[PDB]
Amino acid sequence: RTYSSLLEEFATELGLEEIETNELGHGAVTIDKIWVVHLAPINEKELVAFMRAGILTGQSQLYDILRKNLFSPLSGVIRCALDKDDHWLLWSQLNINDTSGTQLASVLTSLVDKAVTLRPSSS
Amino acid sequence: ETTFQGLTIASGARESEKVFAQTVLSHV
């Protein structure tokens, strides 16, 4: 698989004609007019999918997120950082060759769901 | 633009969001 063929797969899975990318392969999908999930290669073998969500609500969330920030054997796990303004930055890091259009679409929907809470298709 | 699992989705983003992404990606 290549990065660009993976994006083609992902567009097809979502029912878009194309996920355009800039010079460095940075692409984006806008969700319900307001949220944006960004896609980019980060090294030779891996890409990320990520979004800025809302401001942290309180100390309670930081514990909740950290209690869940544990290693996993799964792929497409959603992780959470804070930006300099205490907004959540939600992200997943994936192997280009190991992932599919379907898993990327699951990542996208999981990213969006977290934000709110805070080859043929395999769907 | 289409509908996917209850979400309205389109390729693209407002420029400020692309700027934000460029910032995050340039600091890793």
UniProtKB/TrEMBL annotation, chain A:
SUPFAM superfamilies according to UniProt: Type III secretory system chaperone-like (SSF69635)
CDD domains assigned to the protein according to its UniProt record, in alphabetical order: T3SC_IA_SycH-like (cd17030)
UniProt xrefs under InterPro entries: Tir_chaperone (IPR010261)
UniProt record, GO biological process: protein secretion by the type III secretion system
Keyword annotations: Plasmid
A Pfam family matched in the record: CesT
Name listed for the protein in its UniProt record: YopH targeting protein
